[PDB]
Design a protein around this ligand. Sequence first.
Ligand SMILES: CCCCCCCCCCCC(=O)O
Ligand SMILES: CCCCCCCCCCCC(=O)O
Ligand SMILES: CCCCCCCCCCCC(=O)O
Length: 582
Amino acid sequence: HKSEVAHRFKDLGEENFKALVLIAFAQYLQQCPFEDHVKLVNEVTEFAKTCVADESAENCDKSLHTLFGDKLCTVATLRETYGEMADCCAKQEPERNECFLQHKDDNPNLPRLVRPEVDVMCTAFHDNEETFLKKYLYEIARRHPYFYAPELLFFAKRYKAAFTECCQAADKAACLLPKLDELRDEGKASSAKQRLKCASLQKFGERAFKAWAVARLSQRFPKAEFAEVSKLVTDLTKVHTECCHGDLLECADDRADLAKYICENQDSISSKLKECCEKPLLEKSHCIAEVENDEMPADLPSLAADFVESKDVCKNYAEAKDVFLGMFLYEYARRHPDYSVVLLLRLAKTYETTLEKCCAAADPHECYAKVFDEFKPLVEEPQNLIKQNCELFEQLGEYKFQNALLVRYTKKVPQVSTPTLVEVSRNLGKVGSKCCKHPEAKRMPCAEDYLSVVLNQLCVLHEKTPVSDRVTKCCTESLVNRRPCFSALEVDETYVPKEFNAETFTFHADICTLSEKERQIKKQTALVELVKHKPKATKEQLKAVMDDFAAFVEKCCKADDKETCFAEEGKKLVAASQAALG
Ligand SMILES: CCCCCCCCCCCC(=O)O
Ligand SMILES: CCCCCCCCCCCC(=O)O
Ligand SMILES: CCCCCCCCCCCC(=O)O
C-alpha cells in the first residue's frame, strides 16, 4: 500500500494499462461514444504517469475504487444518458461502487456487431491499427460488461495476431476467415462458461460448487495433498463469488493472490506449472487455469481399502461427513482424469447415499459391502455414449452426422422450434468432431465441457419460451442429472403431427449459388420439418427421401431453364415422397 495507480501502471505497462482502463470504462458507460472513452483513458493514463513520477503527487494516494467512481461521476451527461446511475454519484464510497455495478446492464440493446469485408478490415488495420483494435475492443467490451477484462484483452491480442499475419497473405480471406470463426466461438464458449459457473453458484450453492472444484482441482493436481486441495478449493470458491459479483478490481486482486500462492507452493501442488509461474502478472492465473494435468504418482493405493473395507468408515464419516466425502472425491478424482467432473460427483452422491442408508444398520460393513459395484453402471453409460457417437461420427462425417442427430432429437422433442433444433444439433455435431479426435482418455472430459454450455444455451432459450415439459424437467434438474435426463428422453409418441405442406418443401435455384453453410441450413431445416410431418418414419424411409432430394438438387444445379427444374422436378419429388412416407 504505497500508491494505487502508480503501482498498477508499473507492473502492468502503459500498453496493457491503457487497454484495461478502456475495457473497464466501457463495461460501465456502455452508452458513451468511442471518442469519449479515448479521452478518459488518456486523462487517467496521464494521471497514472503523474503518480509514477511522484508517488506523493495529489490524489495518487486514493484507492482505485475511489478514483474510478470519481472519474465516472465527471461525465457531465451521465444523468441525461444513464439517468438513474447518475444517482450513484451522490453516495459515499463503499455504496457508490456497489450502486454502480448494480446498474450494469447484462443485455445491452445495441445493434449486433457485423463483420465487415476482409479487405476493408485489413485496410483499416493497415492504416490505423491502434484505433482499429481499440474501437473493436470497446465494441465487444460494452456488449459483454461481465466479461473478465484481462481475459478480453487476451483475445484482442489473438485478434491482432490473426490480422497481422493474414492481412499480409495471399487469399487473405482463406487465412483471416477461419481464424475469426475460431476466435468467435472460443470467445463465446468462454463467456458462456463464465455466466454458467456463476449461475450454478447462485442456484446450487457453495457446497455443490465446492464438490465440483474438489473433483476438478484434484484431477489436475493429483500429487497435491487433500489439505492443499481444500485450501485451494476454499480460495477458489471465494474468487468465483467475488468475480461473479462483477467487481473487476476485487476479482482481479483475488485471482492475482491465489496465483501467487499456487506459484510459491508449486512443488507442493504440481510440476506441470513451471512455465505459468514464470509468466507476467497479467497471464499468471489465466495460464494456470488452462494448465495441463500433472502425472498422478505411481504408488496409488486401492480406494476400497480406506472407503469400503476398513471399519470406522462410518465412524470417520459421521465425525465429519463432508470432509470424508470430500476425501472420497479427491481420491477418486486424481485417480481418474478420464472422467467428467459430473461423473465423479455422480459417484460421490451414490457413495454418500449408501453410507447414510448403511451406517444406520446393525451390520454396516456388510451393508455398504458391495458398493464399488454400483459405480460400474454409472461409468459405463457415458462411455458407451461417447463410443457409439464417435463411431458414428466416423462413418458419417460432421454434416451427415449432424443430420443423424437432427432426426434423432426432432423425434424426442418435436415441439421444439425448428431454427432451435437445427442450432442445437449443429453445435452438438461440432462437439463430436472436437472430441472424437483424442484417445478415450481425454474424451469424456472434452465432451462434458462442450455439452455443458450447449445444454445450457438450449435451456436458456426454453426459458424465455417454454415448449416442452420434458426439456424443462431436465433443464431444472441438478447440473449433474441434466445430461443423463436429456439422454433418457424418448421418442415422443404422444405428439400429433402437423399438416403436410409443399411450400415448406419447395426449393428455388438459389441453393445452387448459396454458401455451403447456408445450403446445409436450408437442407437441414427442411429435414427437421420433414420428420415433424412423419416422426414415425424409418431411418430407412427417411434415407431414401434424403437421397432422392440430394440427387435432385445437384441434378438441377447443373441444368438450365433450371428454375423449371426445381419447380417441375420438385413437384415429382414432393409427390413421390408423400407416397413413400405414407
Ligand atoms: C487502472 C486499473 C488497472 C487494472 C487492474 C486489473 C489488473 C489485472 C491483474 C491481472 C489479475 C489476474 O491475474 O487475473
Ligand atoms: C466439499 C465436498 C462435498 C462432497 C459432497 C458429495 C456430493 C457431491 C454432489 C454435489 C451435487 C449434488 O448433490 O447433486
Ligand atoms: C433442442 C432439443 C434437443 C435436446 C437434446 C439434447 C441433447 C443431449 C445430448 C445427450 C446425448 C444423448 O444421449 O443423445
